Copies of this chain bind each other. A is one copy, B any other.
Amino acid sequence: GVSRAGGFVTAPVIGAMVTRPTVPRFGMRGNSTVVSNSELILNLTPIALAYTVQSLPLIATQPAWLGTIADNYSKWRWVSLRIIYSPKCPTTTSGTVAMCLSYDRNDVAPGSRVQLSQTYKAINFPPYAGYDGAAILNTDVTPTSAIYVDVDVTRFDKAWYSTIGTAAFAALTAFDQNQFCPCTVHIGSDGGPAVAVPPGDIFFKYVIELIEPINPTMN
């Protein structure tokens, strides 16, 4: 790379992904139903000078489309969960966007980018970057220029989680939420322009295993 052999860098006016059209794929693994799909989950708050954060609980019901399928199953577990960033602003946008993971709903969100950076899986990056890694979303490859976070799905506290709707989940105390949620992602930013600029969006690319069907009304 440039840090060993030297090189040169250039920058275009702007760059962005074009998402490949797809359909959620279903599969059976014995009595288990496996769903593989990608979903746009969040539009980030316009990046400005001051710091700001957004958080999302990583539960089966968070992605709206998957959420529906989950209502018919009692338990689930993430087989793989990759959080991907997609820029939507020009290379003239100053600032830094960062993401990280937490595992206790009683936690307080990172109050600054320094706090966020000390945390697990923290990745800091310019708001305009990430387009070169489009393949991470459209294919199963992992480009080195892609901006993403892989969740340590094998290091959760429980083996399976019970399905719960987002509204009901929201109404729980942090402690009761802990029983239905294995992890939460935080996305923060700062150092942006005086006139805030929408930086990018967040996608979830996942493979989930759902078990033990249940009447949706009961669940």
A6-B18 in contact (CB<8A): yes
Size of interface on A: residues with Cβ below 8 Å to B? 144
Per-position binary interface string of chain A over residues 145-168, scored 1 when its CB falls under 8 Å from any chain B CB and 0 otherwise: 111111010011111111110001
Per-position binary interface string of chain A over residues 15-31, scored 1 when its CB falls under 8 Å from any chain B CB and 0 otherwise: 11111110111111001
Expressed in whole angstroms, the minimum distance between the Cβ of A204 and any Cβ of chain B is: 10
A91-B88 in contact (CB<8A): no
Stoichiometry, as copies per complex, reads: 6
Expressed in whole angstroms, the minimum distance between the Cβ of A96 and any Cβ of chain B is: 5
A218-B119 in contact (CB<8A): yes
B1-A144 in contact (CB<8A): yes
A124-B86 in contact (CB<8A): yes
Which residues of the other chain, B, contact A135 by a CB distance below 8 angstroms? 6, 123, 144-148
Residues of A within 8 A of B (CB): 1-21, 23-28, 31, 33-43, 46, 49, 51, 64-65, 67-69, 71-72, 74-75, 86-96, 101-104, 106-126, 128-129, 131-135, 137-139, 141-150, 152, 155-164, 168, 172, 175-176, 178-179, 190-198, 201, 203, 211-219
Known pairs A9-B128, A74-B120. 20 more at Cβ < 8 A?
Answer: A2-B144, A3-B21, A8-B16, A10-B12, A14-B91, A18-B123, A20-B123, A24-B213, A27-B28, A33-B35, A38-B122, A39-B114, A75-B157, A101-B212, A104-B164, A104-B219, A122-B137, A122-B138, A155-B159, A190-B198
